[model samples]
Target: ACREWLGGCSKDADCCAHLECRKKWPYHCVWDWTV
Candidate 1:
């Protein structure tokens, strides 16, 4: 399992959506539902 961290994110934040964002990003970005 992975640790969850709260970061700046909107309600629409999703893995599938972040995956798309990841494709265009060059850094590590943690995505959590509680964020």
Candidate 2:
């Protein structure tokens, strides 16, 4: 449905429903796992 962590994204909505869009020079999609 969407890209995984480190995956490219233009905005938060571009990422998966469970992930957030992160920008570090470039843009990417990210998710966190407690484990």
TM-score for each of the candidates = 0.16, 0.47
lDDT of 1 by residue, 1-35 (tens): 22222322222234334421222223222453312
Model 1, position 18, has a per-residue lDDT of 44
The candidate 2 region of ten consecutive residues with least summed lDDT is 26-35
Write down the lDDT of every candidate, Cα atoms only: 0.29, 0.63
Candidate 1 collision pairs? none
Q: Which candidate number maximizes TM-score?
A: 2
Q: Which portions of model 1 miss their true places by more than 4 Å?
A: 1-4, 15-35
